[PDB]
Each structure stands twice: as C-alpha cells, then as structure tokens.
Symmetry: D2
Subunit: 420 residues, 4 copies
Amino acid sequence: FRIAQDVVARENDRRASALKEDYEALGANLARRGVDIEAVTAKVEKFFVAVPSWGVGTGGTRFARFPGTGEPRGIFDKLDDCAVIQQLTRATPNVSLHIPWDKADPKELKARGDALGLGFDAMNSNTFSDAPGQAHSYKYGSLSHTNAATRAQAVEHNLECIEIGKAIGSKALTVWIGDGSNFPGQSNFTRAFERYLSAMAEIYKGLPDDWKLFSEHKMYEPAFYSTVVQDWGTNYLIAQTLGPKAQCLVDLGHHAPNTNIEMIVARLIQFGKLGGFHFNDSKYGDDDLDAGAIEPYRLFLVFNELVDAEARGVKGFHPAHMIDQSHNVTDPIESLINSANEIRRAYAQALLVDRAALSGYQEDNDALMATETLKRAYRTDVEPILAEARRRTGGAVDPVATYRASGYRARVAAERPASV
Amino acid sequence: FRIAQDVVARENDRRASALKEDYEALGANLARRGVDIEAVTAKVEKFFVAVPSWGVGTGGTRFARFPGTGEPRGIFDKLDDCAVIQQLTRATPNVSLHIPWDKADPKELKARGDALGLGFDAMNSNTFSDAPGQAHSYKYGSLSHTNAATRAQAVEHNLECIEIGKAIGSKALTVWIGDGSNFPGQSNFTRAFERYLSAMAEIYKGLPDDWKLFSEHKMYEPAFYSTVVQDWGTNYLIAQTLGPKAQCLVDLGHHAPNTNIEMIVARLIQFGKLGGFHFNDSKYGDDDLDAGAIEPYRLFLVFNELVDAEARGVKGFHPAHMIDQSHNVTDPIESLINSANEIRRAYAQALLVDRAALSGYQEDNDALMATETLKRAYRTDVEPILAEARRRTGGAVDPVATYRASGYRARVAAERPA
Amino acid sequence: FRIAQDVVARENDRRASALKEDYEALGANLARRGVDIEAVTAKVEKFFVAVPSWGVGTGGTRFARFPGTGEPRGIFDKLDDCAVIQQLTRATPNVSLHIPWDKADPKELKARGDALGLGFDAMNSNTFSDAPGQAHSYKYGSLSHTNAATRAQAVEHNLECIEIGKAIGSKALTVWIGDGSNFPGQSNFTRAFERYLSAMAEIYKGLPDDWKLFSEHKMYEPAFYSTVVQDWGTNYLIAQTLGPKAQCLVDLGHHAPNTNIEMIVARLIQFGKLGGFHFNDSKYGDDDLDAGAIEPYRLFLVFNELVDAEARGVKGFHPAHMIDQSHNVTDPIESLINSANEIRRAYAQALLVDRAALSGYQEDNDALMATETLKRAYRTDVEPILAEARRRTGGAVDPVATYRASGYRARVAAERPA
Amino acid sequence: FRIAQDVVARENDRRASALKEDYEALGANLARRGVDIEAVTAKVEKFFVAVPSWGVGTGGTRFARFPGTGEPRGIFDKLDDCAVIQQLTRATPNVSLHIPWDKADPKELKARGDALGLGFDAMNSNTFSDAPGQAHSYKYGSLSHTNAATRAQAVEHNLECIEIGKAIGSKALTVWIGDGSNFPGQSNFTRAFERYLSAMAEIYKGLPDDWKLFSEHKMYEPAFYSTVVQDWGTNYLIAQTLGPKAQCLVDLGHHAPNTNIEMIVARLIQFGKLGGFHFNDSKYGDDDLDAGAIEPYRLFLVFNELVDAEARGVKGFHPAHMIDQSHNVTDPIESLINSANEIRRAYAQALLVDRAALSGYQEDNDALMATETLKRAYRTDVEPILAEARRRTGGAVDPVATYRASGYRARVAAERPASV
Ligand SMILES: [Zn+2]
Ligand SMILES: [Zn+2]
Ligand SMILES: [Zn+2]
Ligand SMILES: [Zn+2]
Ligand SMILES: [Zn+2]
Ligand SMILES: [Zn+2]
Ligand SMILES: [Zn+2]
Ligand SMILES: [Zn+2]
C-alpha cells in the first residue's frame, strides 16, 4: 500500500456524512427522472482507463522542463506512483508501458505490478527518438524511412515490444511514430505511406491471435509540414488494410482546429475500427492537458457516442482507453487522479442521457429538445456518484485531498534525490 | 463569337513583340535546365477546367449581395458569358450546370452550347435549398433526412439530374448537400450516415457506366455543429461503399484550418478515389475566392501531386477539374478568366519539376534540396507559356485586357435589365 | 400579456413540487460551501441581456433560408415575440433595434414597448447592405469606402440611428460593418483604417454626453481576405482614438480558431474599453449558434472574468450585454429563451466561485486546486436557482415547455401570412 | 575567410554564363515594365536580416533532437558558423545573441565579431528556462510570476543582458517569455499582466538613450491555456504603456490559425510600434520552419506592407528584422542561407510592385487589377537579382552549392567534439 489505509479510512470517514447527504439528494433527483442511481454507480465502478507509465513524471516543452520533487526515475519508481492513482481512484488498475524507456526484467516487472495491484495494458513502441548504440537514426523516419535497413530495425523493435508484452500479460501494441516531413517535396506522400503499410504488415504477422495492433494518427508535431499517419482518414485505411486485429486510436488533441472529434469516434465505431480513445484536453494543438480542464462538454459528447455504442451493442466494440498527458505545472499524480475522475464524470453523465427521448427528438427533428436532452444529463453534478463508487471499491472519497494529507509527495521526495 | 475577332487580333498584335521576347528568353532558360518549352506549351494547351454556370453571376453572403451591371438572367445568358471565358482563355470549354437553377429544354441547351463552342461537364444536384413547389423541405436534410418521403424526393431529383445530363453530353453527377446538424444531439451521426448511404446507392443504380458519381465533403456550412459528409475520410467510405464509379471530390476551401490538402489528394489517388477537384482559394473558411489569390504555392503543391500521378503511371487517372467560386466584388467573367489562368499556371509549373532530381533528394533525405527542387519549378514565371498557348489556340495574350477592350460588360449591360 | 397567465401558473404548479425539492437541496449544498442561495438568486433575478429585434425571425445562410410558421413581419411583430421571451424568462427586458429594418414612428415604438413591458437597448446601424433608393452602394465598403460621398452617406445614417434612439430611450449606438477586402492589394490596410477612423469621429460628434459608441470587431465575413475592424487589437485602437465615450464590443464567434476569448474580455476591462459582450456560441467560425450549446465552460469562463471585475471593484464597469444569434433550424423564440437561460446559468455559476480560495491558489501557484475551485462552481447545477428566479418574477419554471403549451406559435402562425 | 575564396570564385565562374543570360533577360522584361533592374539590385544588396546565434545548431522538439555532425560547441563556434552564412549570402552581417547561453567576456565576443566581419543585433534574454544556481525557478513564470523576488530576479537578468549588449555594440533587448497558464483559474489574467507591466517598466528604465525594448507576443507554447503576451493587441498595450523606446516584435508563426499577419504589421506601423519582424514559416503552429518554405506569398505580402510604409512616407521607420528558426532536419547553415535568400526574394518582388498603378486600382475599387498588380511582381523570378547582388558583395551566386563544394561541414565535424 503506497498510501496508508488508515489515512484513507480517516479521510473518507470525516467526509462520509457530507457524501451520504449529496448521494441521497442526487438519488432523489434522479429517481424523479426515472433513473436508479445504483445502476449508474455500479457501471461507474467498473469503468477503467489505462495510465501511461510516463505520465507520472514531470513533462516539458522544447523550451524547458521544470521538475518537481520526488521525480520517479525508471519504471519501478513509476509503477510505485501509478499505484497511488489506482489505489485512490480505483479507475486505473492497468498501466501502459513504453519501450525502451521502461525496459526491465519481465519477471521483475510482472512481480512488481502484481505486488502493487496493477496490471499491464497495451505496449508502446518508440521510434520517434534515438536510443544509444542504435545502428540507424530515426531523424528522417522509422517504419516509413527510405532506407530499408532503418525500417527493418524499426520493425524488429516493435516485435520486441510484443515479446515483452506477452511476458507481462499485455494484449496489444500501440504504434505512434513521428514520421513525416517538415518541407514540401521532402517526402513523396504515397511512397512513404506504402513503405509504412509494408513495415506494419510485418509487425502484424508477429501478432499473437488475441493481440491487437493500434495505429495512432496525428496532424502534426514532430513533423511540421506533413505526417504519414496524419488523420483518422489515413488511419482507417491502415487498419482496414492490415486486418481484423488492427484498429485506430483516437487521441483527442491530435486533430485540426475545430474538428468534430466525437463524429470521428462514431464513424470508427460504425466500421468497427475504433481500437481505443486516448484522453487529454487541448486548446491550441496537442497540448496534452488534463482531461476536461479546457472543454469538459466536448469530453461528454465523445462519451455520448461511446455510451450509445456501449448500450446499442455494435460489432467489434472493445475499446482500450488510455490517458496520454504531459503534466508540466502540477503534481503529476494529482493531475492523473483528477483526469481519471473527469473521464468517469463524463462517462457517468453520458449514462444519464435519456436515449429513448433523444431518439424521439432526433426523429422529429426537434433540435432544441435533442440538445437539451444531452444538457440535462451533462448539467447533472455526478460527483457524489464518482466518490461513492470510489468509497465502495477501496478508493478515497476525495482523492487529491487524501493524497495531500498522506504526505506521499514529501515521502518520495526524501527517497528520490533531485538534480539539485 | 461573343468577342469580335478583330478586337482579339488587335489586342494580341499589341502584345506580340513583348510575348516573343519573354517566350524566347524563358525558352532559352528552360533549355539550359534540360526542358523543351514547346513540350510544356503543348500540354498547357490541353489542360481544361470546367466553369460553374452559377459562377458567371455576381455572388453574395448571408449579409448582402451587390450585383454588378449586365447580370445574366437565366442559363442562356450565363452560357453566353461562359463562352467569353472559353474564347479568351481557351481553357474552359466545358460548363457545369446546376439544377433546377439551370433547368431548361435539353435540346436547346445542347444547341446553344454547340453554337458557342461549349460542352457540358458534370451535373450538380441541389437539395440544399427548397425550390418553389417542392413537396418536402430540406430544412433538416435531404439524402439523409429522417423522413423517408423527403429522402425519396431527393433521390428523384438526383436521378432527374442524370436524365437532363444524358441529353446534353454530361458524364457525371456531383452531389454536395448541406445535411448535418447545428446542435449536439440533434442528429445521430451513425444513423444519419446510414440513411445517406442507402439514398446514394439508389442514385448509383441509375448511374450510367460512362458516368462518375461524385460525392463532395465539407467540414461545415450550412451545418454548424456536424456535417454528414464532413471530410475526405467519410468521403472515402462513401465512394468505397458505393462502387467503382463512385469517386471523391476535393474542394480546396472545404477543409479544417491548416489541413494538408495535397496529402488528401495523394491518398485518394493511391486508392483510386480521386474523382476531381473544385478549385478556389481561401484564408478563413470556404471563402470560394479566386484560385491562387490567397495561397498560390498550395495550389502548385496540389498540382504537384497530380503531375506526379501521371508520371508514376497511375491507370485510368482522369480527374474532372472544375472551378467552384463565388465572385462577390468583381466582374465574375474577369475573375473566372484569371482563376482559370492561375490553375493553368500552377499546372505548368508542376510540369517543370525535375522528377528525377526530386526523387533522388527524397531517397537520400536531402530535405533542403528536395524543397528547392520544387521551388525551382514554382519560382519560374510561366506566363509566357500561358500567353502563347492562348495565342496559338485562338485566345487572348492578355484575356482580361482584351475583355475590357471589347466593352462586353457595357454591351450586355445594355441588353440586360438592370 | 402575450402568454396567457393561466397557462404560466398551470405549468408552474405542475413543476412547483419538483422545483422546491431541487431548490432546497441546492440551498443545503451551498450553505455547506458558505453560500446563501438566496443572495445568489437575488442577483440572478437582476441579470439582464438584450435581445436583437432581428433574432426572433428565422435566420439563414448564403445557401438557403428555411422559414418557420408565423414569421414576424416588421418591428411591431418582432417586439411582440420579444415580449414573450421577456415574459417567460424575465431576462430580456430590453430590445436592441436595427435600422433601417425597424424604422417606424418613435412615439409608437415607445408606446408598444411600454405596453409589452420592454425597453430599448443599443441602436444598430446597417451599412453592410444596400437599401432601395440609396444613392451610393456599400459594395466596396461604407465608413471606410474610398468614395467621400459614400462615407458621408454612411455617417448620416449612423447619425440618424442616434436620433431615433434618443427618441425611444436608447443610450448607445453599435457599429458593425463588413468593410474589408477579398483580395490582396484591393485595400490599403492603413488608408482604409484612417478613413474609418475619420468617419467614426464624425459619428462620435453626434453622441449625447451620456451615450456610448460601440465598435464591433470580426475576423472575417463578409470580407474574406481582410477586415478593417478585424480583432480586439484594432478595436482598442479605435476606442482609444475616438474618446471616452467609445468602447469595444466582444462577440464570441468573431475570433480566430482557439483564441482565448476570456483573456480579451479581461484586457479590455483592465483598460476600460469593454463596452459589452455579444453572446452566442460557435465551433467553426461566426456560427451564431445558441449560447452555451457548444462550449458552456467557455461561456462560464467569460463570466468568471465579468464577475472578477466586480470582485476587484472595477469602477465605471457597466457592460451592455446582448444576444446576437442566428436561428436557422429551431423556433427563434425557443432558442432565444434557452440562450438567455444559458447566459444566466454561466452567470450564476460565476457567482459561486470562491474568490478568496481562488486568489489563494493563484498566489501560491497551486494550478490544480485553482482550476478545481472554478470547476466546483461550474459543475454545480444552478437550474433550480434560475427556475426559481423566473417563478418569483412572473416567469416560467420551464420557459420552453410553457411556450409550447400555450400554442403561441400556432397563434401568430394564423395571425401572420405565410 | 571561413570559406576559401578560390572555391567561391570557382563556383561563381561556373555559373556566370547562366546568370548573365537570366539577369539580362529579366532586366529587359523589367525595362518593358518601366522598372530599372539595377535600381532593384542596389536596394537588394543592402537589405540585411539578423541571424540568431542559437540557429546554427540543430534544433529539436519535446519528442527528440537529432543532431548532425559538427554541432557548435559554444558561442565562438556559433559565430564562426554565422560568418559562413554572411560570407556567402552577404545578407546577414549581424548576429543576435542569447543570454545566458552565449555568455562570455564581452571584449572577446566583440573581438571575434570584428574578426569575422559580423556585428551584433538585438540582445535576447532568457527567463523561459532555469539557469544553474538561480535563487528562484521560472516554472510558474518570470516577469509576471506571483513571487516578488522571482520577478526582481528576472528583471536583473534583463538588465545584465543590456550591459553585455552595450559592451558589444547592441542597441536593443528583445524580451520573449513563456509566462502564462496551462489551466483556467491558475492565473488572474489582469493581475499577471499588471505584474508584467510593472516589471517591464523597470527594465525600460535601464535602457540607454539610443536603445529600444522589444516585447514579443505569442499565442501559445510553453503555456497551453493562456499567455500573458498572447497577441499584438496586448503587445501594443505594452509598448504604449512603457514608452517611445518600447516597440512590438512580430514573429510570423506566433499567431492563431488564418490570422492576417500582414495587417498586423500595417497596424503596428501606423501607430509607430513595429520594432521588427521575426522571420520563419509555418503551417500548424509555431513550427519555426525555413522562411518562405510553406507560404512564400504571405512572406511577400508582409514585405508589401513594409515597402508600402516607405511609399506612404512613414518617418523614422527602421525595423529590426531577425530570423528565428529551428532546423531539426537540415544542415542549420544551409537552411539559414536559403531562408535569408527567401527573405530577400520576397523583399525584391515587393520592390517591383507598381505602387502608382496599385494606388489607382485601390481608389477606384478595381479589386481584380489591384490583386493582379501584386501578382505581376510576386510572379517575377528575382533569383538573378539576388545572385548578382551576392556576386557584387563578395558572396556566392549559389550559396548552398558553394557551401557544399567547400566541405565546410565535414571540416568542422572533425574539429568539434560530439556531446556524449
Ligand atoms: Zn495518444
Ligand atoms: Zn499526444
Ligand atoms: Zn465544390
Ligand atoms: Zn464550396
Ligand atoms: Zn455581435
Ligand atoms: Zn456575428
Ligand atoms: Zn521570435
Ligand atoms: Zn517562435
């Protein structure tokens, strides 16, 4: 236990009356709306989202990285911090690894995860940066590089990510590369895409029967003119061409300005190619900010589509969700905790939508009442639901508050010497 | 001849000397670069782009419309003006009609075209506005409207466009609707798209083998929250789903800010779904401005993908090129003329690209030289070639100058009600 | 009374039981946060936003207009509909008129307003479209047109607006123009701005001592390349140059993609040039959609700045708020009603912000808690406070429901032509 | 000479014939247009743009950095590299330093400059990153930070930059900070701006009589929610508040999507607050790509505004232009060489515009001929002019090729230690 259980008990107990009071008042409100709070809380308790191992360390920009105290160094420190998030929120039982950043003895990794109450989600390859001793540089690309040997090296690396994953209980490989161009003419759009497809096919072959291969699109950065896997369009083409085990990941901040992202999610669901959604928020580009800190309604609308599919069924709908953020000015553990909270909030509110009435208003072209139908769910403060769900599953009523009272940050600060 | 042949001759002779000097100098420059200027002029003389019948009249915004003098009244006046663009540029031999705005007797349309020296490009259906006497309003959609009757009506209108088209020489149906929503929840994305797909399939059945069914995506406007056919991604799903004769249409100004459009072009070409282009320029949204008036380089880069397609030997690749612009503050004829000129300008520069050298710099990851290889073609002032091509084919060295020296605007201003 | 009072009371009783429960519960919740739900309600009852006389009529785009039943015709019909919005929501006691659209005997407008329980807000001049019998077209601009006569005509019209407003009680003139260019070179940015400044100076001279002159910026549309008053930066230059009675209007959907609108509001407030805010919502451009229907948090954040201004004790702060929306796919009356409610919602949420706690987290750079302090206020469902505010002031608990139960649309649909 | 003269000579002679044919042809074409080419060349050979010392090193993103061979070791190697750019383009006689990065004995900096034929442009302060031993971190800001001692520390640093500048011949301080917030509520917008204005006033107070203070706006990055100096509006307010010596710097890639940047330039000129223009090119955000590589027409339109200023007779307009770019996938020296060329290219075309005819078309609202009048200039290939200008001033007819023929990169690669 990273956080002392008595601390959690103590903090949860001092707030129990306040929680009960809010949970009952909201229950009566929902009752009058033909909604059983219990059924909502039970689904909220089972909604999980994978945490990225690299998310608990302080992020930065090309201009600077301002570390806080107790920076986790290495996958072990990182797992230890991810455990706090899971313990207090009970919404992140699985961690997503990144190779080579988190390379370590498989057996040791698994053992550490099991001891912490954490599992492992999709593996993440890295061919957007060069590692020491690497024979071929990825400066000009990897899987789509013009040099065959470089592509081969990129493919072999992704294969190794699978072998590591197979050994720790993982069932998928996410592939996000920087590949693209910064100048017009630098790359031949079609030929680079062909090279990419060809290299991905080889990785696809190394896929066990129960594994999936996720490709992630991004409009720009690190490439500033063109990017091989630039949008969900190219992303769909990829998934369809690779096969059944290949699907597309939709990362909120990876789209052009004003893009209707929730429609992209619905389009992928329909054609059974939505592998999963990567949560974060943005205002300008791929800001990788805390989920819901900028546009919480947008987040709700995305979840509205997920819930529609989750309820109405849909062939091939088994999303692998993950938070992908950079925490440059906050305590990384606190931001991930509140972001996971935000993700469950949007989920919970999506569950309140009256699907029948909505469908009626859409059929009648009653736009005002259709949008109002969503707003009724969205405007609902489901915090008591999120907190109770946490309380019933070993979590903290108020995660951040509990995390602060535990002095966890100061503790790892004493154990982890900083640069200065 | 909408324009007096003597006016054309006078204004050409007035610029002949200068064109000879410019053409020979560029000819010499290109020879040093290993390019035969005659081979380019020959290709430029063959590049054509369709003019929109509805682009010959002054356009407007939701705030106002400020018509100029001699506004065309009806499709026949419009064809008369389109003939001027063709006569002077020799690059716009085909007119794309819009129904029901251009509804008229087929035989007459065909005859007028033949007399003016104009053919007919793709037909354009219109279910994004209610025509008088219409049974069902498209207020809430057409091909994807929730009401079955409204959808059938829209389907029927599209089939009718095909009938009118067969009788006048058209070989394609362009489908662009405003279908979408302005509010979250108003529509169910998936079901709306399913309806659209079923409707389009019905239209596909009635599509002749010598025709192409072009669907056109747009991010927003008229719909401000979501649009059924919002981007090329959906456009590809549509075309793929519909059949070998269904292709995607790419309108330059119909994309999200900063979208790399030339890549969209390359992607569609690779999967054989690039039906054609709708040229125009923009800076903010779907501004429908004169081609290359805002970003001429982007226009060159789009054409760079087109010229590369041919070089890479892509089979059956014959995209239909059409200009889709609104002229709110200029003489629609001059704009269209210069827009067509700009399009040909971009194409000619693209032809100057040293494909071998570019391929070499791309393989060796010499980004600087690869970009400079494109710039060397783009920086070349190809006006001499554009002017010569026009001259050798009956056009004007300086189209707009000739157009103004004829007093055509004043003329039709006196023949048409103000 | 446009809406039968028996209906208003019947629909309120029908929901009076559920409301009391929700109200008491929120009251209890707020008390635990050290907030007296009555003080909040008291201030919400006093928050007003003006309604545009042109907003009650169905809006459209350059592609089509899909009118509904009983479309109002003329100012008097529009005032009748605005009265409904005011009666049910009690948040729109003032109407903003637009000339020449609403030109009519001032004495009559004044009387009809007093009878309907409506006042008149800022006047709106119209030089972005031509009226019949107009001597000079505004095709190429109005207050900044190169033609002196045209600028003079634009100035007189605005002066005329001031006069009509002086007779009906208005205290401000709002000037939004389309003036700009669609092509590079068409306008000399500086010369054009100079002309605008000089002309606005003349309109300023016709301002009574207690009036305000509001200049409204807009990035683009109808001008697609450049706009004389393109952003708040240029807007500030205008207000600072004209004088103390000149201020800037910030319209939500008139900004570039991703712009931080709330910072703009704060900057203008800091320098005393925030004349007022124009509410609506958007996703792509100047969509003019219902306020908060797309991005409610942004709406809330704008109000957070408005509320903080009072908290810091900004002197002379009296913004003239107004709704500026286009309703193309819903009953205009219904949309304006929910827009006004959404506005009050953001306002009430802004009031719930624990300023002491917030400044505390800002001071010690506790970003996470600072942002959570806002969220605690924003996430709070204040509908009961809004519904209770309307009930106590003669409005409806569920305005749109009451409106639909009254059958008002069918009524005016019968009294008015199709 | 960084580049041997026999090489520059040989390469020039190799291209003399083609240059002669293209220049004389163009000259004739211009004569037929009523333009004397010699007059353009004479103005072109005197147009200078300052080069950033931090631009001759390979740049990177927050994802990776892929250095090339011969990366400059310190400021002295960097000046050496800038000397090559100057020798070959003859368009970048001045270098802009960045403190503390370029810290060194002012006497030695000045001496190396004079020795290489380089002058020093605007000084650049750095409070967007933490240098060793600071009493306070700029993590949450610098000049607008809530902590008084932190702001005082940033102020002092800027004053030190001025002292170094005065010792080496600089006449200005460029201030660009990262200050802002990544979360709504994190900063009180107004309080932060007030703190920034007060602090900047103190820096202003340290300005010599003939120095200028340039404040540079930027929409986002590193801050992803709000930025203190976010746009030209805020920038104008700053310059007007500080005084006559304070002006605004306009960096191309620092504006929101679709922004009309040329108008901004016009607006700042009209009110006398355009201190200078930082050149680069972009497509998505602050891409910092080679100038004119993405949108050459927009570059031309910016110059059109600069030149129209002289046409309208603006007095005392002497803007301080600088290139501010990041070269992640090219030889920095080559990218800087071609960017400088592109800038002179756009400047030359702007000089070719028929202002007389243009003012006529603007007055009678002939939109079409007005736009075509600019195009007739922009479409003109002025390369021959740029090349001749370089030949006349000791530069190379084709800088990049001459640079490659010299083998300068391999030479410095064998002299400079790669970081380990
Ligand atoms: Zn991701
Ligand atoms: Zn990302
Ligand atoms: Zn189109
Ligand atoms: Zn269009
Ligand atoms: Zn407005
Ligand atoms: Zn507007
Ligand atoms: Zn800069
Ligand atoms: Zn920058």
